[PDB]
């Protein structure tokens, strides 16, 4: 009911250029100063750089661009307080399979302060839907452009409760308004300026069609003009400017219908903006400056880790329960498996070269399946991950191990339901023994050649570009493999151990051919079993290449820290 | 200057109902007419059905759950008149590099009537960026949520010029004033009034948050409130109705966010809501219905063709421009080949074992590398391929011969890459007329493989289902391609010839070692080119899978209606 942690945003004489294709100012000194306790409404026309000067004050635009001192509390943005930052941005990106209660209570879960009870994170959670309305569409999807779910005024208060189910100090809307009619708008800015006026925080909003009703509810006002400012101060004080300057309406009209047609440049009665330019340049923005530079300033460490991996991971699982391509998938890898013994199904155990053929098919198929399909995993998760990467919702660390935990349900069922067919149907080496030593090596190299495809797609953000990398990749280590090329040169004997394919192939031709004595009594001192690498310094690179991949993978990721 | 041909839009006792996870009812039991040469506008609160109404009465919507009629001008919507409708539809998707003349000119140059010069289609195109005052964004591209672009308020106005680029009859705009501030959304219902009035088109607007002035613009208004409709009538007329029934505001206040909250159930001063649609039922949704039942009702077409293939080659182009992942993949395809070339330059002509592999793995590399690109072509254009074959912006022949065409630039570079250290670092067949049909096996060979990465991801519109589809799918091809299992049963030996991988490792078999006498004279009767099928029935059925795979290509992106 009363105040919490302050932030004074400070803003000082901000600018952004880009180059066009000289240069052009989207903003072009900006200054105010967002005390705690204000409700700030940033207006102006649909081009003057409102969403790059709260992207700028949000910590989500940085670069050579910008030239401008952003003070939070006299100090610069960090990491520390963009966690009491919440911003709600002009596109929604919301995932699309959940409900709306079970987005937000997920985001209850996540942000609220960890030392409560649950029940009090679900009524918190259930407290925010009753406050926007959001009650009638409970329990309805947030699908995408295909898939039909919640209207489009309720997926921006979706998006609003998001970030109130933070309990943030510095609360930056970019147009929270669009969307919404004349009497959930009127409620919405009734409900920040409560935040602003009694919780004490620090409430800064980009309204573009505000009535004369919501133009009241506003501490501050400031009006952009093609970047440059045309008054920063009080809402009930605009109108007794512009007069001093000469602009008076000829009807009485809105005050934010004259505000925003004086930014234009019309007035309903010849250089109305430079004029509007020139007059608080020199009548307002020294008083606005000298007015702000006066201004001065263990064991339950592992239990929210695992706390935030579980709810990630029943996030992750509930997405993949709409689609129902794992029959499919199934049914076309019974398929190639049904091709795959009845091509052997002539074979012998005294062919070897026949079955080397067959153990390195098995090679090829299960190092370019679930590395091909790896590559979707990170590049489909891009827009939403940067996003609440720069939210701070979760660590980089409970996010990776859930698509690590998570992949690892069926892509250990299609090997297993590959070579129930092919191992039986072939018949090769009967026994219990080298059947499961056979699915043990099938299942680490399924891991060690998944992590392949997740390193590359974490490198490179995009399921197209990645996909011809890792296609090369694959055919590289398919021909350095084993089975191909025999008079090698001796400068390139050396590739085939970087290659992940090698040490399956070699391990189920020593799994099959055992030693190399049991199938020289019955006749390939070269090509079968007798080699260079051992039975145990092959299952150590393999999950040497498991745990390294999924390293690079995870470093990988943590460049994108926007 | 005058009127065009004139659409009158009826929708009578549309209902429109969802499955939860009963029924609910989105819509229910909706009633109007809408003139040619009137303004209707669609207001409501953010959860009515406004966007489903205006979806259903622009033919976007259809199937099991809409239960009313929909006429235009007393029949059904066929596809002849959805060629005069233009829909704005509430998200904005737009190609992500283009510029915002170069998407204008683009859609002027399509849809204008054909029978005019050019000059005028483009004075045409600039004369509505005049009009929605796009001129200081001309220039900037129209970028993605991970490109930045022009404000989401340009990206409105030019989702609007995109549709006023076609001359309509029916304008059904889905929320265009969401977005603008106050003076452009003024400006923009000025124009569209201007295009009711003097142009005599017929537009339906759902607006949402209107002003006092934008309010008096309306001819007729439709005010919905959770399905049920409130009122139908005049803009003028409303207020004079509800005092009828008994609501009057406390204040003099704007007629919008009076009618909104009548439609929310807030007087200001007990059941309002129901009162008034029993209200409505009774008193003046009889005399509506009486109302609308009383209202009665070739060388240049190659030449069409190919300027739409030119048109929408140039945009294909135009954002393949922005992407520089190009020098990766011939850097990558060119290290892959001097590693192909490295690991068999020990090899000699007479070792015909040591070739037949080579010769496989080239058919391995090229039947993998294409058809696992193709894959992205359809599933990544999805979301405006829909739009725009909504809309009927262009013919589907012409717009698939356009991606088969800018195809054919880079997949013919990179096997002609590969090649050229592969053939002659490896120092096979000499000569040019070898080497030459060598390169143009291959890149017969890719065209072929192509068509099915095309095929499956046209048929199915996701690439991330589809990469285990191919995969499966050329493993299978690779499997029966003529390398692996030496005795394959009787009842198999048909499999060879569905692959493409069998035609190509046929016909590079054949160029290398020619007929079967110039090697056995040096010293492989069965393996090599002694085969079954010939060297003119293999690039007959290449050809015929170049072509059969793209016509299956075509027939599944014909099942996209919608
Ligand atoms: N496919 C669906 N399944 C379930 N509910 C739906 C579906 N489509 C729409 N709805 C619900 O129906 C209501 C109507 O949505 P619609 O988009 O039709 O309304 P709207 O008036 O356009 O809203 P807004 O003004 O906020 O955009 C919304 O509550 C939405 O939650
Ligand atoms: N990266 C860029 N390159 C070129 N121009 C840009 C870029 N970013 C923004 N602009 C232009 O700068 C202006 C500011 O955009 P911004 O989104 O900052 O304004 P806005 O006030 O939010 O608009 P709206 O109210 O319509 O959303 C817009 O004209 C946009 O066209
Ligand atoms: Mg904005
Ligand atoms: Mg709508």
New binding site residues.
């Given amino acids: 009911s009363s105040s919490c942690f302050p932030i004074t945003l400070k803003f000082v004489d901000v600018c952004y250029r880009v180059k066009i294709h000289e240069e052009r100012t989207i903003l072009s000194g900006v200054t105010g100063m967002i005390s705690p306790g204000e409700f700030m409404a940033v207006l102006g026309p649909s081009g003057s750089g409102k969403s790059t000067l709260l992207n700028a004050v949000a910590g989500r635009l940085h670069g050579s661009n910008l030239t401008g001192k952003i003070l939070i509390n006299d100090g610069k943005i960090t990491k520390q307080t963009l966690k009491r930052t919440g911003f709600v941005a002009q596109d929604d990106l919301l995932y699309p399979h959940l409900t709306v209660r079970e987005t937000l209570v997920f985001v209850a879960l996540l942000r609220l302060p960890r030392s409560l009870t649950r029940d009090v994170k679900l009524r918190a959670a259930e407290s925010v839907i009753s406050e926007l309305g959001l009650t009638?569409?409970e329990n309805?999807?947030v699908?995408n452009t295909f898939?039909?779910?919640?209207?489009?005024?309720?997926?921006?208060r979706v998006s609003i409760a998001h970030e109130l189910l933070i309990n943030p100090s510095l609360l930056v809307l970019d147009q929270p308004t669009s969307?919404?009619?004349a009497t959930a708008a009127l409620r919405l800015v009734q409900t920040l300026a409560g935040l602003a006026h009694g919780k004490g925080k620090t409430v800064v909003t980009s309204i573009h069609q505000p009535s004369s009703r919501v133009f009241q509810m506003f501490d501050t006002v400031l009006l952009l003009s093609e970047g440059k400012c045309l008054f920063v101060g009080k809402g009930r004080d605009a109108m007794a400017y512009f007069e001093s300057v000469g602009f008076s309406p000829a009807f009485p009209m809105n005050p934010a219908d004259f505000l925003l047609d004086l930014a234009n440049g019309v007035c309903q009665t010849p250089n109305v903006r430079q004029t509007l330019v020139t007059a608080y340049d020199t009548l307002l923005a020294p008083q606005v400056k000298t007015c702000i530079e006066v201004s001065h300033f263990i064991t339950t460490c592992i239990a929210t880790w695992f706390s935030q991996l579980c709810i990630l991971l029943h996030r992750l699982l509930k997405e993949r329960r709409h689609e129902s391509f794992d029959l499919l998938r199934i049914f076309q890898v019974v398929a190639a498996s049904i091709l795959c013994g009845l091509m052997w199904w002539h074979s012998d155990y005294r062919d070897v070269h026949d079955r080397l053929g067959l153990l390195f098919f098995i090679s090829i198929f299960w190092g370019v399946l679930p590395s091909f399909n790896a590559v979707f995993t990170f590049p489909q998760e891009r827009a939403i991950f940067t996003r609440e990467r720069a939210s701070g919702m979760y660590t980089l660390s409970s996010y990776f191990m859930a698509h690590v935990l998570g992949s690892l349900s069926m892509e250990l069922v299609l090997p297993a339901s590959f070579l129930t067919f092919t191992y039986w149907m072939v018949y090769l080496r009967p026994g219990i023994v080298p059947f499961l030593l056979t699915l043990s090596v099938l299942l680490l190299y399924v891991l060690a050649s998944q992590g392949l495809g997740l390193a590359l797609g974490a490198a490179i953000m995009d399921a197209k570009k990645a996909s011809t990398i890792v296609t090369v990749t694959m055919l590289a280590f398919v021909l350095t493999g084993g089975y191909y090329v025999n008079k090698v040169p001796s400068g390139m004997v050396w590739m085939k151990y970087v290659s992940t394919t090698f040490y399956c192939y070699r391990l189920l031709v020593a799994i099959q051919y055992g030693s190399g004595e049991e199938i020289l009594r019955m006749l390939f001192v070269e090509e079968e079993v007798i080699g260079d690498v051992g039975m145990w310094t092959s299952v150590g690179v393999l999950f040497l290449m498991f745990f390294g991949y999924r390293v690079l993978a995870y470093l990988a990721l943590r460049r994108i820290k926007h």
Same sequence: chains 1, 2.
């Fill in positions: 009638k569409c309805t999807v699908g898939i039909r779910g919640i209207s489009g005024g309720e997926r921006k969307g919404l009619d």
